[PDB]
Design a binder for this molecule. Structure first.
Ligand SMILES: [Cl-]
Ligand SMILES: [Cl-]
Ligand SMILES: [Cl-]
Ligand SMILES: [Cl-]
Ligand SMILES: [Cl-]
Ligand code: NA
Length: 129
């Protein structure tokens, strides 16, 4: 599923991601825009052999099991394919664990490079929230 901007903002808010660990909704919508272009089915292979999955490009190196990242962990205790569903529940719950692990949203390199320090509120402007 490819979300619309306001549609994703509404879903993220409903799942309690807005202001989670101090990060406003705009930060999460911005991260998703540049990680996946709002596409739940997004996948990308990393140089080390792991793969990033879903709307927030969660890495099989640490967080999910895809059966093909030898030596990796599964800290969210989910198949990586669950991160590709049209329902973003699994992605949100995993993202909450990632952003809680000490480095905040810096875990998402696209957020650090393209969202951090910018007018992130622009990403939710105009939406009926
Ligand atoms: Cl915001
Ligand atoms: Cl594996
Ligand atoms: Cl393969
Ligand atoms: Cl959803
Ligand atoms: Cl933080
Ligand atoms: Na894994």
């Amino acid at each position: 599923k490819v979300f619309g901007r306001c549609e994703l903002a509404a879903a993220m808010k409903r799942h309690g991601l807005d202001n989670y660990r101090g990060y406003s909704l705009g930060n999460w919508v911005c991260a998703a825009k540049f990680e996946s272009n709002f596409n739940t089915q997004a996948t990308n292979r990393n140089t080390d052999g792991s793969t990033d999955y879903g709307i927030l490009q969660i890495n099989s190196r640490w967080w999910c099991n895809d059966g093909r990242t030898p030596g990796s962990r599964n800290l969210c205790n989910i198949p990586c394919s669950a991160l590709l569903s049209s329902d973003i529940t699994a992605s949100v719950n995993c993202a909450k664990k990632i952003v809680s692990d000490g480095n905040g949203m810096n875990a998402w390199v696209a957020w650090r490079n393209r969202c951090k320090g910018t007018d992130v509120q622009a990403w939710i402007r105009g939406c009926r929230l």
